[PDB]
């Protein structure tokens, strides 16, 4: 679920998902167009694609379980959708961690009109 993803994001990064990642660039928290602004935004682009891979799942609301094994996220077995949603979220949270070094606040609240063009998953 979105709340679980937000908790994972905070755990990884130390940033609150709202506001740090909910309106960032072209693809985070919202959006389907544009060239991603930076690596963090590309995490979001890929995450959006990952959810798009799951048209008969409900990633915003369906809950999954995960644990940590020496820091590492391990998604525990639930339904098929839950497992796949968890793997999408895990990847994005790791990606955000891997790209903190370039996170930029100037991309929070990024205006929609600066995001144009489709980029295929």
């Amino acid at each position: 679920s979105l709340l679980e993803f937000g908790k994972m994001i905070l755990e990884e990064t130390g940033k609150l998902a709202i506001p740090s990642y909910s309106s960032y660039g072209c693809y985070c928290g919202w959006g389907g167009k544009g060239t991603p602004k930076d690596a963090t935004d590309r995490c979001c682009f890929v995450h959006d694609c990952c959810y798009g891979n799951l048209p008969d799942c409900n990633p915003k609301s369906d809950r999954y379980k995960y644990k940590r094994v020496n820091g590492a996220i391990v998604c525990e077995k639930g339904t098929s959708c839950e497992n796949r949603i968890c793997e999408c979220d895990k990847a994005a949270a790791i990606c955000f961690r891997q790209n903190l070094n370039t996170y930029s606040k100037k991309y929070m609240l990024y205006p929609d009109f600066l995001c144009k063009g489709e980029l295929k998953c």
Binding site: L2, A17, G29
Partner: peptide, 4 residues
């Protein structure tokens, strides 16, 4: 929360 985000959207995605």
């Amino acid at each position: 929360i985000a959207r995605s």
